[PDB]
Amino acid sequence: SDEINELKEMVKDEHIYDKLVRSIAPAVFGHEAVKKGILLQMLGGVHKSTVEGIKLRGDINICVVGDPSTSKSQFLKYVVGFAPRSVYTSGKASSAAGLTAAVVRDEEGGDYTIEAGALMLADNGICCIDEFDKMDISDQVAIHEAMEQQTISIAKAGIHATLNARTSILAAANPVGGRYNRKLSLRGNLNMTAPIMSRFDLFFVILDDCNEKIDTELASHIVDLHMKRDEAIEPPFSAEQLRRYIKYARTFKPILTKEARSYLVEKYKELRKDDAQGFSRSSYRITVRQLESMIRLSEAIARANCVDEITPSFIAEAYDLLRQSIIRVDV
Amino acid sequence: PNVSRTIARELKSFLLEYTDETGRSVYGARIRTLGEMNSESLEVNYRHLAESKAILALFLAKCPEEMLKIFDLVAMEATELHYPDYARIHSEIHVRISDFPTIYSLRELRESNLSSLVRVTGVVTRRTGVFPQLKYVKFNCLKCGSILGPFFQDSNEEIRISFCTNCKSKGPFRVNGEKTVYRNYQRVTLQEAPGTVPPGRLPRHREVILLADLVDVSKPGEEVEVTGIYKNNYDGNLNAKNGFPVFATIIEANSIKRREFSWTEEEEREFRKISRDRGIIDKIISSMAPSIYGHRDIKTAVACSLFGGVPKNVNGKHSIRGDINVLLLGDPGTAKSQILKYVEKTAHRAVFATGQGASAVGLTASVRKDPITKEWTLEGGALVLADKGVCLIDEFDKMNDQDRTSIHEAMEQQSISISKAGIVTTLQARCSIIAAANPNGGRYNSTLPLAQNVSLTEPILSRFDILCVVRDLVDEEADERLATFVVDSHVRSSPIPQELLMKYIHYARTKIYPKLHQMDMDKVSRVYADLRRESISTGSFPITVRHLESILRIAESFAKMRLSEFVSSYDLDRAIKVVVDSFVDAQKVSVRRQLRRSFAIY
Amino acid sequence: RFDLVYLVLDKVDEKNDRELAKHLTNLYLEVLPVEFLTMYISYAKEHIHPIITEAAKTELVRAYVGMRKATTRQLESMIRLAEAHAKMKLKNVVELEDVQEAVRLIRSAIKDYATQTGKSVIQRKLQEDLSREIMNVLKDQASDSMSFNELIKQINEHSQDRVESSDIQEALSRLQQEDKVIVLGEGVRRSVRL
DNA sequence: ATCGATCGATCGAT
DNA sequence: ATCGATCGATCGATTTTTTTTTTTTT
């Protein structure tokens, strides 16, 4: 009703692209660009077409990592109590099923009761976890499985089933050293396989260290969080007004058929022509799926900007996003 | 109502003379089709009749029960005019008709939906064996005389026979085996589809009724659609409830459909005209995975097992193996996992259990009974679900070794067997078998032989006739050839229509049986001699006796694709070339030297 | 993640345990509020809602700067702890002087820390030497690989820096995840191929 | 085996 | 004398029931 006037009042504002970000997660301090992707995980791409056929993704993924007490927990607990049907786990003992079917016994009078379980219900929603290294490899399989087939088939000695999970997924697995190790190639730095690695675009590493200016800022900004007051400090947007705005942003299916998409190609060419040498840098390859997420990147961008068919300048943004995303794998 | 008899004339009009797409009534053909088929169950497009009168369909929406029970009557004679003496055959039919949304799931239904036909979706579940139905009641009675004539009952009531046939009682009515028509009957359980299951809520159980042709046609664990009629039926006692008093709901679908098509004369006939072209083989690659692009080569192997082939039986012994065991060496970031999924909706019969952890189901038969309780249930391995249907699996590396035994197991005897527990049988399952697993570690495991590439044993891999290996290290134009292709693919928001091509194979697997002429095939025994020892010269071996057997199962495919009914040289031309470099790529980078010798086999 | 850790220890004070045993020497036979504190346990809950105001914040900062000189998780407690002291004495505002021993109560666990993954290189130098060792063996030995036993001979034996076999294996695993090495089975150990 | 309802008659009322 | 209700003799239906071989999980 009158709420939509707020949208038109919101849609007119240019700086909201910045404001949406500053309004993202004030409980957290800084980290900036990491925040945006959260919103970006909150609106995926078309996650649809193009026939005949296969349904192209769609979705998106991030696992942000760094020194413990980075308060990376701030993000998950933020959106977990923020976005609807946002599901979260300790990411260590689900145990396995968890996401797997038990499969449940007995009945009684029967057996083989099929639980989903766990991450299904987040379907078409943002799923977040912690420390894949804690759940080991056993579920990394199916975890990677859900990352390919999306919806997963399951059973044990029961009746066959294929369960639908199309779910935006993020998580955080602490560094094996919890530190850097800057010279560490992110590829071997993560204590996990490339396919689950290449599947999520992208993890977006961040690190923390003492800065006396920020140490006072942390001393300042963080304590106000501890503060009963001032709680008066606020982001530009009420979380709710943006969330309803989110759905308005959700309605869109922006499609860039614009010939600037052609410009994106060499941008991918220019993206990976350099990565041929050396391979000891952020490579990867880079993955061709990266261009796919590069698609879903713009898929996330246009929604925030509300305009269909996007733009190359926007294309640069997601491109540059990957660049820093990738450069975190550098050194 | 009696005026509805007048409806019959009009409703039978659309039954016959109606046509669309250059005339050609399907029902006129429907009559002639079954017909020699003698399906004795007609189907009608709801969309077309709704296009004519939905008011009639509204009765089907109102009370379809007698509506068709009226509607079926002339349908018999409406055919019988086409089949003057057929009445001697079956003297009955009923239309399954067509899409009737609904499109309702399970747990969403209401007494509003009761007694009116409702198409419904659900997952097939355990069911009783097919039983005889009372069909038409009749009474040899007691004091009153035979035969008394048959009474129509029941599905399912049959009453009450109070006072009659002579007199009345105590000379009362009782059924006799003579002159009493019966029919097949099956109760069934179908739960709602888990993929369509709302999260954390347990799927609801639903009774599944089966009568006439519909019976036993369904198989347990199948994804399926059903067009039934929801009712409070029946009974109600259920003296247990009582509070609050109810008749426990049950439904019989007029129709059933597997997950989620068939050829016809006018279809196949022009469809035959498609087959005559030789270059059709290419558009088969063109229609392979048009949205995928990818390797024309990788799809070639896809085209192979996907197309299937003759077993073929050897009197009175083994039929060998007519199904292809497909294997794919993966690459990270590659479309490989996606393709088999194309085959998934592609395949008439298909099942994908992926690797393990485990996707449906146990990958093997674990079932032990357990009389008690109540009867328990018996099942086989994942392949049991689809027989003659191709296997779908990926990344065996993530599979447990116990289930991985059944892997080499299934491809071997082509019959399933296990030790649990008291029940003893021999299960025979024949499935083409697809495999795609990602190489250990990086993009390419080692230049060294794939035995070094894969932890998986060659002997278990040996059952794999086709190995799909992929690449590559980054190339300049490579993505221009794809990424540009890909970007244009996403622009959406040459190949045959999949209906034709999917019908093409099923039509083929159902019909055409190619056979080689031993004469020109002698060359392969000669041409193979080049393909073993020289191929033996490098690697260990890895030439296999079974490997040669593949080339024929290879050849059989293209011929049916040629619809030749017999093996042709051109069929071999691909058959060899398919195998040549396939065996070649398994070699180390030293294979570049191995390439030059294989040139003679081109 | 734990709010605090109190580490129990025995110094064998002479001089402690005797009088402790003399405290144990009680019963034997035959100012301490008992329940009155338990009501104050309840009373201090809903009826006291302390706010630290400005003063306490200033002190809390410099301590933590020396704390890391720790974690904001420790900073998380420093507020949570003192305000508990603030819950004491019926205070609706925290005393600026509590947080001293509040950090000190943290210091108490900190005095326990005077007494591995957190010390500079450790496995790193090892992996540099493991790499250099297998590389030298790669360029010397006719293989790109060498036996894990030969590794335990060529690593562990030479120096204290050199770690025990299992821990080499841990370093090797972490190098295997780096693609700096190849397992080549359990029988042997291989260097990563180009 | 006993309890349960049907059903038959009969003796009073109108 | 017509009608009834009343009692009784007529008729026929309802009375037990859960433990040892298992099997997907680390």
Ligand SMILES: Nc1ncnc2c1ncn2[C@@H]1O[C@H](COP(=O)(O)OP(=O)(O)OP(=O)(O)O)[C@@H](O)[C@H]1O
């Ligand atoms: N040759 C190609 N042509 C078109 N698209 C491709 C190609 N290779 C990869 N892709 C894209 O990359 C994605 C690959 O996902 P897929 O379903 O194949 O899982 P996967 O990459 O095989 O998993 P893994 O590599 O971890 O085993 C697809 O969405 C597909 O669109």
